[PDB]
Amino acid sequence: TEQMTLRGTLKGHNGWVTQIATTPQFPDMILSASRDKTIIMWKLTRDETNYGIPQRALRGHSHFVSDVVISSDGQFALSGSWDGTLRLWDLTTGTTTRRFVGHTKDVLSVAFSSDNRQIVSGSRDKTIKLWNTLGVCKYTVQDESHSEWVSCVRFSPNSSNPIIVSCGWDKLVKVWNLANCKLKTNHIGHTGYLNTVTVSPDGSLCASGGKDGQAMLWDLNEGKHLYTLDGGDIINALCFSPNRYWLCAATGPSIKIWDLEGKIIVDELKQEVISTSSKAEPPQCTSLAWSADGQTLFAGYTDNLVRVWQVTI
Amino acid sequence: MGRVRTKTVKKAARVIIEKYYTRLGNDFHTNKRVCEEIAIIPSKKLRNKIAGYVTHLMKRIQRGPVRGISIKLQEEERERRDNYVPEVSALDQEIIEVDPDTKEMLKLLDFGSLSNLQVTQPTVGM
RNA sequence: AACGAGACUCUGGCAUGCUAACUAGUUACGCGACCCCCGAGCGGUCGGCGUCCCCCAACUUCUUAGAGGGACAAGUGGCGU
């Protein structure tokens, strides 16, 4: 079966990498966020000396940047921050065209709609919130929301079932109808708080995880439970492959992949030892992205680096 | 210089960990946000000092016991050293040797018949 | 268990992020005016100098001052019953 190998590393940051984002429109570009308050745009290269260079940096947020996402045309990017404000960036000039305001705490995740005509967000303020791209808020979920911090929000990629999924510190996963503005279904099972939720590109399955170290699968349209996978110590991020039936997870200092035909671990990715006089000797992995080609993986870390892996035979 | 923490900081940090161990971790910037919603703290400068000692105590509790703090996860494995151990399926067996003056003490008590015997040294060890 | 200590109150150093100013400014131009040709090049569109003057132009970097943010011995290496 297929096996990963280390390609190279990217060095231009002064705090933990918080997220990475990519598109099929520009395969020599990637974009990433950090606790150093700024978003970096990278020029990738196939040169033997170093795999990429910081090309531009976006500087307008006043605390940490928590989430970042790119428009399907590759012209614009959207981001949230621990300063409680949400911003839309023109990637050609490196300037914000609009600013979104109306949360009263601290913003943990954001997404674009699959048509890119609507925006959604989640926060420590306990409210999910919906926005028009002209910067005006359109609905607020309030009493039916999570009882604790809203950790994540995501859209289904398909057009024929317009719904969103979410996870929170009250250890529930919830599913919501877009046009009707209402809750559809709870899912219950996890013992710890939740860090992440994700959906397969065919629009069929969820995955979710957090402190309990378990990845659990769920149906989007059949409304029911599927099998549980033990990850290890903790789950920081999850993603599906774009062209294989694989789930991938970032788990403490290591990254891991499951082949879902026959439910088996393909490989686990680890770091060369730097001897350290304390517990948690290695730095942890914080975020993942597969390239639009599917053949290469980007991963971010608490040691201010992005590490790149290829597939091999 | 002096960076020693006063009893107002050290007592509030212990009471937080007794009630909210499942919320906490190694990241100071996340602990600083948790301690602001589970407690009323009058000053920003006091909140930072409490979340600092909570972050120090979490890294100790990952290694072993701290005498002033208790949690279910550590009590139930104490309760597994309590009750019975995996060490052996039977007692240390009663087939043990007897000295001549213990043989004589048991003879006067109408007992014996199950022990081997040998004598000690010719004179008291010096 | 109580008072003193510490916390606490005022103050200094950071924010091209927020709120928004004819009793505070900048940039720019519809432009208008004086002086110099030193300037590719003319006595010019274009250059230089301005506490010289309008804006029914755009804006908040520099000034004012309200709200929040930020630092914890928090990170790494030694020494410590």
Side-chain angles (χ1 to χ4, degrees), chain A residues 118-119 129-132 135-141 181:
Chain A
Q118 302 180 352
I119 292 160
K129 190 165 296 212
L130 319 183
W131 313 85
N132 294 38
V136 58
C137 179
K138 197 54 53 179
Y139 195 71
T140 50
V141 174
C181 312

Side-chain angles (χ1 to χ4, degrees), chain A residues 59-60 62-63 87 99 275-277:
Chain A
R59 277 157 286 127
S62 65
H63 203 176
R87 294 178 82 165
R99 184 169 194 154
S275 55
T276 302
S277 302

Side-chain angles (χ1 to χ4, degrees), chain A residues 58 61 65 82 113 117 160 183 192 195 224 231 233 252 254 297:
Chain A
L58 315 179
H61 274 128
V65 179
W82 288 34
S113 169
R117 306 312 299 180
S160 67
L183 180 68
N195 283 97
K224 295 176 187 76
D233 51 355
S254 313
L297 178 78

Side-chain angles (χ1 to χ4, degrees), chain A residues 61-79:
Chain A
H61 274 128
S62 65
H63 203 176
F64 308 157
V65 179
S66 53
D67 197 339
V68 67
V69 65
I70 311 175
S71 175
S72 65
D73 59 10
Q75 298 296 119
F76 295 95
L78 180 81
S79 63

